Write a protein that binds this ligand. Structure first.
Ligand SMILES: CN(C)S(=O)(=O)N1CCOCC1
Length: 191
């Protein structure tokens, strides 16, 4: 999680889409969805990113509706955004033991127990936290089985990016569970 603000320059695709849904939280605007193969994914926007400015207008106080309207009404040859990097999230680094375990249990992407004497206990992993990313890959809307698969196939170093469940549950409200599964960019980014 970068400790600062960054500018991204965006470009509506042939269909006038950028591949983004935005959400009002605590009078800010946050990324709810980044669509696979979109302008939003190619510039590196991420779930949980805060949008500070669009085209140098401040977002503070906007409804989700107004942010979506502003995006639509933009002469989008070049859209600038000022982004604060996933402010509600933290990254934890853990090491599999020789049985291949980092040492927790999750349900619906939510960590529910930490196993004593584990890398997850040693690194202070918390329960009541949703898994946003593993090893730089967005996992939101994957089945629990597919998240366990990704951990299985990871090298011994496992990076997990987590969010307080209450904040997570507030961000994904009014987004159907199959849009998250179908359309949320789960890919490794392109270079
Ligand atoms: C209970 N399931 C959906 S599971 O067996 O597929 N499971 C494996 C262990 O981590 C959590 C997910």
């Amino acid at each position: 999680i970068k400790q600062g603000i960054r500018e991204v320059i965006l470009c509506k695709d042939q269909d006038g889409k950028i591949g983004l849904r935005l959400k009002s939280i605590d009078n800010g605007i946050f990324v709810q969805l980044v669509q696979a193969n979109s302008p939003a994914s190619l510039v590196g926007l991420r779930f949980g990113d805060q949008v500070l400015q669009i085209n140098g207008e401040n977002c503070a106080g906007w409804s989700s509706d107004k942010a979506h309207k502003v995006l639509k009404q933009a002469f989008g040859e070049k859209i600038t955004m000022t982004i604060r990097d996933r402010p509600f999230e933290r990254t934890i680094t853990m090491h599999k033991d020789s049985t291949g375990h980092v040492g927790f249990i999750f349900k619906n992407g939510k960590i529910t127990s930490i196993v004593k004497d584990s890398s997850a206990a040693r690194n202070g992993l918390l329960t009541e936290h949703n898994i946003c990313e593993i090893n730089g890959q967005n996992v939101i809307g994957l089945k629990d089985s597919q998240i366990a698969d990704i951990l299985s196939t990871s090298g011994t170093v496992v990076t997990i990016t987590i969010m307080p469940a209450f904040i997570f549950e507030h961000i994904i409200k009014r987004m159907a569970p199959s849009i998250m599964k179908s359309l949320m960019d789960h890919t490794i980014p392109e270079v």
